[PDB]
CSV table of C-alpha atoms in Angstrom, one decimal:
chain,number,residue,atom,x,y,z
J,1,UNK,CA,167.1,309.3,208.5
J,2,UNK,CA,166.8,306.2,206.3
J,3,UNK,CA,169.7,305.6,203.8
J,4,UNK,CA,171.1,308.5,201.7
J,5,UNK,CA,169.1,308.6,198.5
J,6,UNK,CA,168.7,310.5,195.2
J,7,UNK,CA,165.6,312.2,196.7
J,8,UNK,CA,167.7,313.5,199.6
J,9,UNK,CA,170.5,314.6,197.2
J,10,UNK,CA,168.0,316.6,195.2
J,11,UNK,CA,166.4,318.0,198.4
J,12,UNK,CA,169.8,319.4,199.4
J,13,UNK,CA,170.5,322.8,197.8
J,14,UNK,CA,173.5,324.9,196.9
J,15,UNK,CA,173.7,327.6,199.7
J,16,UNK,CA,172.7,325.2,202.6
J,17,UNK,CA,174.8,325.0,205.8
J,18,UNK,CA,176.4,321.8,207.1
J,19,UNK,CA,173.7,321.5,209.7
J,20,UNK,CA,171.0,321.7,207.0
J,21,UNK,CA,172.8,319.0,204.9
J,22,UNK,CA,173.2,316.6,207.9
J,23,UNK,CA,169.5,317.3,208.8
J,24,UNK,CA,168.3,316.2,205.4
J,25,UNK,CA,170.9,313.4,204.7
J,26,UNK,CA,170.7,311.9,208.2
J,27,UNK,CA,173.8,312.2,210.2
J,28,UNK,CA,174.1,308.5,210.7
J,29,UNK,CA,174.8,308.2,206.9
J,30,UNK,CA,177.5,310.9,206.8
J,31,UNK,CA,181.1,311.6,207.7
J,32,UNK,CA,183.6,314.4,207.6
J,33,UNK,CA,187.4,314.7,208.3
J,34,UNK,CA,189.7,311.9,207.3
J,35,UNK,CA,189.7,311.4,203.5
J,36,UNK,CA,187.1,314.1,203.0
J,37,UNK,CA,188.6,317.1,204.9
J,38,UNK,CA,185.9,319.6,205.6
J,39,UNK,CA,183.5,318.2,203.1
J,40,UNK,CA,180.5,316.0,204.1
J,41,UNK,CA,180.3,312.5,202.5
J,42,UNK,CA,177.0,310.7,202.8
J,43,UNK,CA,176.7,307.0,202.2
J,44,UNK,CA,173.9,305.1,200.4
J,45,UNK,CA,173.3,301.4,200.8
J,46,UNK,CA,176.3,299.5,202.3
J,47,UNK,CA,176.8,297.1,199.3
J,48,UNK,CA,180.6,296.8,199.9
J,49,UNK,CA,182.8,298.1,197.0
J,50,UNK,CA,181.5,300.9,194.9
J,51,UNK,CA,178.7,301.9,197.3
J,52,UNK,CA,176.4,304.8,196.2
J,53,UNK,CA,177.3,308.2,197.8
J,54,UNK,CA,177.2,312.0,197.8
J,55,UNK,CA,179.9,314.5,198.7
J,56,UNK,CA,179.1,318.1,199.7
J,57,UNK,CA,181.7,320.8,199.6
J,58,UNK,CA,181.4,324.1,201.4
J,59,UNK,CA,182.7,327.7,201.0
J,60,UNK,CA,184.9,327.4,204.1
J,61,UNK,CA,185.2,325.5,207.5
J,62,UNK,CA,183.0,328.2,209.2
J,63,UNK,CA,179.7,326.9,210.8
J,64,UNK,CA,177.8,329.4,208.6
J,65,UNK,CA,179.5,328.2,205.4
J,66,UNK,CA,177.4,327.3,202.4
J,67,UNK,CA,177.2,324.4,199.9
J,68,UNK,CA,179.2,325.4,196.8
J,69,UNK,CA,179.8,321.8,195.6
J,70,UNK,CA,177.6,318.7,195.0
J,71,UNK,CA,178.9,315.4,193.8
J,72,UNK,CA,177.2,312.0,193.6
J,73,UNK,CA,177.6,308.5,192.1
J,74,UNK,CA,174.9,305.9,191.8
J,75,UNK,CA,172.1,308.0,193.6
J,76,UNK,CA,170.4,309.4,190.4
J,77,UNK,CA,169.3,307.4,187.4
J,78,UNK,CA,169.2,308.8,183.9
J,79,UNK,CA,165.6,309.3,182.7
J,80,UNK,CA,166.0,307.9,179.2
J,81,UNK,CA,169.6,306.7,178.5
J,82,UNK,CA,170.4,306.5,174.8
J,83,UNK,CA,174.1,307.4,174.4
J,84,UNK,CA,175.9,305.6,171.6
J,85,UNK,CA,179.5,305.8,170.4
J,86,UNK,CA,178.3,307.6,167.2
J,87,UNK,CA,176.5,310.2,169.3
J,88,UNK,CA,179.5,310.5,171.6
J,89,UNK,CA,181.7,311.1,168.5
J,90,UNK,CA,179.3,313.9,167.4
J,91,UNK,CA,180.1,315.8,170.6
J,92,UNK,CA,182.9,318.3,170.2
J,93,UNK,CA,184.8,320.5,172.7
J,94,UNK,CA,183.3,324.0,172.6
J,95,UNK,CA,179.7,322.8,172.5
J,96,UNK,CA,177.2,324.2,175.0
J,97,UNK,CA,175.6,321.9,177.6
J,98,UNK,CA,172.3,322.5,175.6
J,99,UNK,CA,174.0,321.3,172.3
J,100,UNK,CA,175.5,318.3,174.1
J,101,UNK,CA,172.1,317.0,175.4
J,102,UNK,CA,170.5,317.5,172.0
J,103,UNK,CA,173.3,315.3,170.7
J,104,UNK,CA,173.6,312.5,173.3
J,105,UNK,CA,169.9,312.4,174.3
J,106,UNK,CA,167.9,314.6,176.6
J,107,UNK,CA,167.6,311.9,179.2
J,108,UNK,CA,171.0,310.3,178.8
J,109,UNK,CA,172.8,312.2,181.5
J,110,UNK,CA,173.0,312.7,185.2
J,111,UNK,CA,175.1,315.3,187.1
J,112,UNK,CA,178.2,313.8,188.6
J,113,UNK,CA,179.7,317.0,190.0
J,114,UNK,CA,178.8,320.7,190.0
J,115,UNK,CA,181.0,323.4,191.7
J,116,UNK,CA,180.6,327.2,192.1
J,117,UNK,CA,184.1,328.7,192.7
J,118,UNK,CA,182.4,332.1,193.2
J,119,UNK,CA,179.2,330.9,194.9
J,120,UNK,CA,176.5,332.4,194.8
J,121,UNK,CA,177.8,333.8,191.4
J,122,UNK,CA,177.8,331.2,188.6
J,123,UNK,CA,181.0,332.6,187.1
J,124,UNK,CA,183.4,329.8,186.5
J,125,UNK,CA,180.9,327.0,187.4
J,126,UNK,CA,182.3,323.6,186.6
J,127,UNK,CA,180.0,320.7,185.7
J,128,UNK,CA,180.7,317.0,185.1
J,129,UNK,CA,177.9,314.9,183.6
J,130,UNK,CA,177.9,311.2,183.5
J,131,UNK,CA,175.9,309.9,180.4
J,132,UNK,CA,174.8,306.4,179.6
J,133,UNK,CA,173.8,303.9,176.9
J,134,UNK,CA,170.6,302.0,177.7
J,135,UNK,CA,172.3,299.7,180.3
J,136,UNK,CA,175.1,302.0,181.3
J,137,UNK,CA,173.7,302.9,184.7
J,138,UNK,CA,172.3,299.4,185.4
J,140,UNK,CA,173.1,294.6,184.2
J,141,UNK,CA,172.6,294.4,180.5
J,142,UNK,CA,174.7,294.4,177.4
J,143,UNK,CA,174.8,298.1,176.4
J,144,UNK,CA,177.0,299.1,179.3
J,145,UNK,CA,178.7,302.2,177.7
J,146,UNK,CA,179.1,305.4,179.7
J,147,UNK,CA,180.8,308.7,179.3
J,148,UNK,CA,182.1,311.7,181.4
J,149,UNK,CA,181.6,315.1,179.9
J,150,UNK,CA,182.9,318.2,181.6
J,151,UNK,CA,182.1,321.9,181.3
J,152,UNK,CA,183.2,325.2,182.5
J,153,UNK,CA,180.6,328.0,182.2
J,154,UNK,CA,178.3,325.6,180.4
J,155,UNK,CA,180.8,324.9,177.7
J,156,UNK,CA,182.4,321.5,177.0
J,157,UNK,CA,186.1,321.3,177.8
J,158,UNK,CA,186.4,317.6,177.2
J,159,UNK,CA,185.0,314.1,177.2
J,160,UNK,CA,185.9,310.4,177.8
J,161,UNK,CA,184.0,307.2,177.4
J,162,UNK,CA,184.1,303.6,178.5
J,163,UNK,CA,182.5,300.5,176.8
J,164,UNK,CA,180.4,302.4,174.3
J,165,UNK,CA,179.4,300.8,171.0
V,1,UNK,CA,177.7,274.7,211.0
V,2,UNK,CA,178.8,272.7,208.0
V,3,UNK,CA,182.5,272.1,207.3
V,4,UNK,CA,184.2,274.7,205.2
V,5,UNK,CA,184.5,272.6,202.0
V,6,UNK,CA,180.8,271.6,202.3
V,7,UNK,CA,179.8,275.2,202.8
V,8,UNK,CA,181.8,276.2,199.7
V,9,UNK,CA,180.1,273.5,197.6
V,10,UNK,CA,176.7,274.7,198.9
V,11,UNK,CA,177.6,278.3,198.0
V,12,UNK,CA,178.8,277.3,194.5
V,13,UNK,CA,175.5,275.3,194.0
V,14,UNK,CA,173.2,278.1,195.3
V,15,UNK,CA,175.1,280.8,193.3
V,16,UNK,CA,175.2,278.7,190.1
V,17,UNK,CA,178.7,280.2,189.8
V,18,UNK,CA,182.2,279.1,190.5
V,19,UNK,CA,184.0,279.6,193.8
V,20,UNK,CA,187.7,279.6,194.3
V,21,UNK,CA,189.3,279.7,197.7
V,22,UNK,CA,192.4,279.0,199.8
V,23,UNK,CA,193.2,279.1,203.5
V,24,UNK,CA,197.0,279.4,204.1
V,25,UNK,CA,199.0,279.4,207.3
V,26,UNK,CA,200.7,282.8,207.3
V,27,UNK,CA,204.0,281.8,209.1
V,28,UNK,CA,204.6,278.5,207.3
V,29,UNK,CA,202.7,279.1,204.0
V,30,UNK,CA,201.2,275.6,204.2
V,31,UNK,CA,197.8,275.1,202.5
V,32,UNK,CA,195.1,274.3,205.0
V,33,UNK,CA,191.8,274.4,203.0
V,34,UNK,CA,191.6,274.7,199.2
V,35,UNK,CA,188.8,274.6,196.5
V,36,UNK,CA,189.6,275.4,192.9
V,37,UNK,CA,192.7,277.0,194.2
V,38,UNK,CA,194.6,276.7,190.9
V,39,UNK,CA,191.7,278.1,188.7
V,40,UNK,CA,191.6,281.6,187.4
V,41,UNK,CA,189.4,284.4,188.8
V,42,UNK,CA,189.1,288.2,188.0
V,43,UNK,CA,191.0,290.1,190.7
V,44,UNK,CA,188.8,293.2,190.5
V,45,UNK,CA,189.8,295.7,193.3
V,46,UNK,CA,191.8,293.0,195.1
V,47,UNK,CA,194.7,293.8,192.7
V,48,UNK,CA,195.2,297.1,194.6
V,49,UNK,CA,197.1,295.3,197.4
V,50,UNK,CA,199.6,294.1,194.8
V,51,UNK,CA,199.6,297.6,193.2
V,52,UNK,CA,200.5,299.3,196.5
V,53,UNK,CA,203.1,296.6,197.1
V,54,UNK,CA,204.8,297.7,193.9
V,55,UNK,CA,204.5,301.4,195.0
V,56,UNK,CA,206.1,300.5,198.4
V,57,UNK,CA,208.9,298.6,196.7
V,58,UNK,CA,209.8,301.7,194.8
V,59,UNK,CA,209.7,303.6,198.1
V,60,UNK,CA,212.1,301.1,199.6
V,61,UNK,CA,214.3,301.7,196.6
V,62,UNK,CA,214.1,305.5,196.9
V,63,UNK,CA,212.4,305.8,193.6
V,64,UNK,CA,209.1,307.0,195.2
V,65,UNK,CA,208.0,308.8,198.4
V,66,UNK,CA,204.6,308.3,200.1
V,67,UNK,CA,204.6,312.1,200.8
V,68,UNK,CA,205.0,313.0,197.1
V,69,UNK,CA,202.1,315.0,195.8
V,70,UNK,CA,200.4,314.0,192.5
V,71,UNK,CA,198.1,316.5,190.8
V,72,UNK,CA,195.6,315.3,188.2
V,73,UNK,CA,192.6,316.6,186.1
V,74,UNK,CA,189.1,315.8,184.9
V,75,UNK,CA,190.4,313.6,182.1
V,76,UNK,CA,192.1,311.3,184.7
V,77,UNK,CA,188.8,310.4,186.4
V,78,UNK,CA,187.1,307.1,185.9
V,79,UNK,CA,183.8,305.9,187.5
V,80,UNK,CA,183.8,305.4,191.2
V,81,UNK,CA,186.2,307.9,192.7
V,82,UNK,CA,184.8,309.3,196.0
V,83,UNK,CA,188.2,310.4,197.4
V,84,UNK,CA,190.1,311.4,194.2
V,85,UNK,CA,187.1,313.4,192.9
V,86,UNK,CA,186.9,315.3,196.2
V,87,UNK,CA,190.7,316.1,196.0
V,88,UNK,CA,190.7,317.2,192.3
V,89,UNK,CA,191.7,320.8,193.1
V,90,UNK,CA,194.3,319.9,195.8
V,91,UNK,CA,196.0,316.8,194.5
V,92,UNK,CA,196.8,313.7,196.7
V,93,UNK,CA,200.0,312.2,198.1
V,94,UNK,CA,201.1,308.8,197.0
V,95,UNK,CA,200.2,307.5,200.5
V,96,UNK,CA,196.8,309.1,200.4
V,97,UNK,CA,196.2,307.5,196.9
V,98,UNK,CA,197.1,304.0,198.2
V,99,UNK,CA,194.8,304.5,201.2
V,100,UNK,CA,192.0,305.5,198.9
V,101,UNK,CA,192.6,302.6,196.4
V,102,UNK,CA,192.8,300.0,199.2
V,103,UNK,CA,190.3,301.3,201.8
V,104,UNK,CA,187.6,302.8,199.5
V,105,UNK,CA,188.2,301.0,196.1
V,106,UNK,CA,188.8,304.4,194.6
V,107,UNK,CA,189.2,303.6,190.9
V,108,UNK,CA,190.9,306.8,189.7
V,109,UNK,CA,193.4,306.6,192.6
V,110,UNK,CA,194.4,303.1,191.4
V,111,UNK,CA,194.9,304.4,187.8
V,112,UNK,CA,197.1,307.2,189.1
V,113,UNK,CA,199.2,304.7,191.1
V,114,UNK,CA,199.2,302.3,188.1
V,115,UNK,CA,200.9,304.9,186.0
V,116,UNK,CA,203.8,305.2,188.5
V,117,UNK,CA,204.6,301.5,188.3
V,118,UNK,CA,204.6,301.4,184.5
V,119,UNK,CA,201.0,300.4,184.1
V,120,UNK,CA,199.5,296.9,184.0
V,121,UNK,CA,202.6,295.6,182.1
V,122,UNK,CA,204.8,297.1,184.8
V,123,UNK,CA,202.7,295.7,187.6
V,124,UNK,CA,202.8,292.3,186.0
V,125,UNK,CA,206.6,292.5,185.6
V,126,UNK,CA,206.7,293.2,189.3
V,127,UNK,CA,204.6,290.1,190.0
V,128,UNK,CA,207.0,288.0,187.9
V,129,UNK,CA,210.1,289.5,189.6
V,130,UNK,CA,208.7,288.4,193.0
V,131,UNK,CA,208.0,284.9,191.6
V,132,UNK,CA,204.3,285.0,190.9
V,133,UNK,CA,204.2,283.4,187.4
V,134,UNK,CA,200.4,283.2,187.3
V,135,UNK,CA,198.8,286.5,188.4
V,136,UNK,CA,198.4,289.1,185.5
V,137,UNK,CA,197.1,292.7,185.1
V,138,UNK,CA,196.3,293.7,181.6
V,139,UNK,CA,194.0,296.6,181.7
V,140,UNK,CA,193.3,299.8,183.7
V,141,UNK,CA,190.1,300.8,185.7
V,142,UNK,CA,187.3,300.2,185.0
V,143,UNK,CA,187.8,297.8,182.1
V,144,UNK,CA,189.8,295.4,184.3
V,145,UNK,CA,186.5,294.5,186.0
V,146,UNK,CA,184.9,293.2,182.8
V,147,UNK,CA,185.2,289.5,183.9
V,148,UNK,CA,184.5,287.9,180.5
V,149,UNK,CA,184.0,284.1,180.8
V,150,UNK,CA,187.3,282.3,180.2
V,151,UNK,CA,189.3,285.4,179.6
V,152,UNK,CA,192.7,285.2,181.4
V,153,UNK,CA,193.2,289.0,181.5
V,154,UNK,CA,193.3,290.6,184.9
V,155,UNK,CA,193.1,287.3,186.8
V,156,UNK,CA,194.8,285.5,189.6
V,157,UNK,CA,194.3,282.1,191.3
V,158,UNK,CA,193.5,281.7,194.9
V,159,UNK,CA,196.8,279.9,195.5
V,160,UNK,CA,198.9,282.5,193.6
V,161,UNK,CA,197.3,285.5,195.3
V,162,UNK,CA,197.7,283.9,198.8
V,163,UNK,CA,201.4,283.2,198.1
V,164,UNK,CA,201.9,286.7,196.7
V,165,UNK,CA,200.2,288.3,199.7
V,166,UNK,CA,202.5,286.3,202.0
V,167,UNK,CA,205.5,287.4,200.0
V,168,UNK,CA,204.6,291.1,200.2
V,169,UNK,CA,203.7,291.0,203.9
V,170,UNK,CA,206.3,288.7,205.5
V,171,UNK,CA,209.3,288.2,203.1
V,172,UNK,CA,212.3,290.4,202.3
V,173,UNK,CA,210.6,291.6,199.1
V,174,UNK,CA,209.4,294.6,201.0
V,175,UNK,CA,211.1,296.4,203.9
V,176,UNK,CA,209.7,295.9,207.4
V,177,UNK,CA,208.2,299.5,207.3
V,178,UNK,CA,206.6,298.8,203.9
V,179,UNK,CA,205.2,295.5,205.3
V,180,UNK,CA,203.6,297.3,208.2
V,181,UNK,CA,202.1,300.1,205.9
V,182,UNK,CA,200.6,297.6,203.4
V,183,UNK,CA,199.1,295.7,206.3
V,184,UNK,CA,197.8,298.9,207.8
V,185,UNK,CA,195.9,299.9,204.6
V,186,UNK,CA,194.2,296.5,204.7
V,187,UNK,CA,193.4,296.9,208.4
V,188,UNK,CA,191.7,300.2,207.6
V,189,UNK,CA,189.6,298.8,204.8
V,190,UNK,CA,186.2,300.8,204.9
V,191,UNK,CA,184.1,298.9,202.4
V,192,UNK,CA,184.5,295.2,203.5
V,193,UNK,CA,181.7,295.2,206.2
V,194,UNK,CA,179.3,292.8,204.4
V,195,UNK,CA,181.9,290.0,203.9
V,196,UNK,CA,184.2,288.3,206.5
V,197,UNK,CA,184.0,291.3,208.9
V,198,UNK,CA,180.2,290.6,209.2
V,199,UNK,CA,180.9,287.2,210.8
V,200,UNK,CA,184.2,288.0,212.5
V,201,UNK,CA,184.2,287.5,216.3
V,202,UNK,CA,185.2,290.4,218.5
V,203,UNK,CA,188.9,290.1,219.5
V,204,UNK,CA,190.0,288.8,216.1
V,205,UNK,CA,192.6,290.4,213.9
V,206,UNK,CA,191.5,291.3,210.3
V,207,UNK,CA,193.1,293.0,207.4
V,208,UNK,CA,191.4,292.8,204.0
V,209,UNK,CA,190.8,294.0,200.5
V,210,UNK,CA,187.6,293.2,198.5
V,211,UNK,CA,186.6,293.5,194.9
V,212,UNK,CA,183.4,293.5,192.7
V,213,UNK,CA,183.2,293.0,189.0
V,214,UNK,CA,180.8,292.1,186.2
V,215,UNK,CA,179.0,288.7,185.6
V,216,UNK,CA,178.8,288.3,189.4
V,217,UNK,CA,182.5,288.6,190.1
V,218,UNK,CA,183.2,289.2,193.8
V,219,UNK,CA,186.2,288.6,196.0
V,220,UNK,CA,188.1,289.1,199.3
V,221,UNK,CA,191.7,288.7,200.2
V,222,UNK,CA,192.3,288.6,204.0
V,223,UNK,CA,194.6,288.0,206.9
V,224,UNK,CA,192.9,287.1,210.1
V,225,UNK,CA,193.2,285.2,213.4
V,226,UNK,CA,192.1,284.9,217.0
V,227,UNK,CA,193.6,286.9,219.9
V,228,UNK,CA,194.2,289.9,217.7
V,229,UNK,CA,196.9,288.1,215.8
V,230,UNK,CA,197.1,287.5,212.0
V,231,UNK,CA,197.3,283.7,211.7
V,232,UNK,CA,196.0,282.7,208.3
V,233,UNK,CA,195.5,284.1,204.8
V,234,UNK,CA,192.0,283.5,203.3
V,235,UNK,CA,191.3,284.3,199.7
V,236,UNK,CA,187.7,283.8,198.4
V,237,UNK,CA,186.7,284.5,194.8
V,238,UNK,CA,183.3,284.2,193.1
V,239,UNK,CA,182.6,284.3,189.3
V,240,UNK,CA,180.0,283.7,186.6
V,241,UNK,CA,176.9,284.0,188.8
V,242,UNK,CA,173.7,285.9,188.1
V,243,UNK,CA,173.1,286.4,191.9
V,244,UNK,CA,172.7,289.9,193.4
V,245,UNK,CA,175.5,291.7,195.2
V,246,UNK,CA,173.7,290.9,198.5
V,247,UNK,CA,173.5,287.2,197.9
V,248,UNK,CA,177.1,287.2,196.8
V,249,UNK,CA,178.0,289.1,200.0
V,250,UNK,CA,176.0,286.6,202.1
V,251,UNK,CA,177.7,283.6,200.5
V,252,UNK,CA,181.2,284.8,201.0
V,253,UNK,CA,180.3,285.7,204.6
V,254,UNK,CA,179.0,282.1,205.1
V,255,UNK,CA,182.2,280.6,203.8
V,256,UNK,CA,184.1,282.9,206.2
V,257,UNK,CA,181.7,281.9,209.0
V,258,UNK,CA,182.5,278.2,208.4
V,259,UNK,CA,186.3,278.7,208.4
V,260,UNK,CA,186.0,280.7,211.6
V,261,UNK,CA,183.7,278.1,213.3
V,262,UNK,CA,185.9,275.2,212.3
V,263,UNK,CA,189.2,277.2,212.8
V,264,UNK,CA,190.8,274.6,215.1
V,265,UNK,CA,191.5,271.6,213.0
């Protein structure tokens, strides 16, 4: 129990069951059905609009199904956000994840969504990063952010908001 | 305890911001309580009620169906999209998108719906068509939340928004079925707990939509009343305050509490 947190999000692993996820997240924070189908959505602090959250997807509806999908917003902070528009412009589709981080800053990104369509195999893995200027994840003037998305660790596209 | 106007002035003082509100009788449309009701405030996610009014008007006209499935891709996603991100692979119906935009402030959902009504320009044209000559949407999510001081883009006035809500929900602008559906999405609002709902007595009706923006922008549009009946429209906006989300939540709740305590009168 306690609120859903970045710590709990990191604790939860690909391969875990629904019961394991609820056990770690705290069932009082989480919901299934409705808008989320057979995924489990776990809520951070009830701030009103745009509250922090995680969503966990599973291989099937079976009780023994495994986490194949982890998404979050506003639970994890970038370690050293330094994205700029010039850096963003230097990123090109086809780049590896490694090449992207070297370009935008090694601590500029967090993982928005990560899905394994052949879990436990990594074949076809999709990954969305959110990356940030210095105040992008905060308050503060440098509020730019970006969404970079990969399939098999290779960049398929990018989009930005408010970058300078 | 204090009278609504006095509570509002206290909130404005404590926030070091500006507050704008109106309380309007639903049936008659008469103004009951007003403060800065003709001044402009960023709509933030409160615009999504107008957005889905436009969607329903197309449904009434046969140009749209709530059961229509829309598919979309990574490039369509903007920040804060709990529901639309979950349904990336499967798509969502128009009705599911409105439910997500209104009840969860899902930003990408609003952008998908915005495209169906001809974007901000198209939504603003709808506003003008229904006789709102003040409210304007200019940008898409998430830039519409920017709330630059003095910038008229993406703003309404408490008075205009209250009138427009009344038009959408009780006039012939929408079919009866579309009226009930728009109301229902607001009844089912999931993220409005900290505001009026936090001080709403058991047994009262409430249907609402909230918004949060930059520079302290915060807002609620609501229909509420005792005995499980919608009686009045209450619109409360905040802007240009450095206060925390929680303080902003508390202040709106306090204004709500005053209106509720002093309801009769």
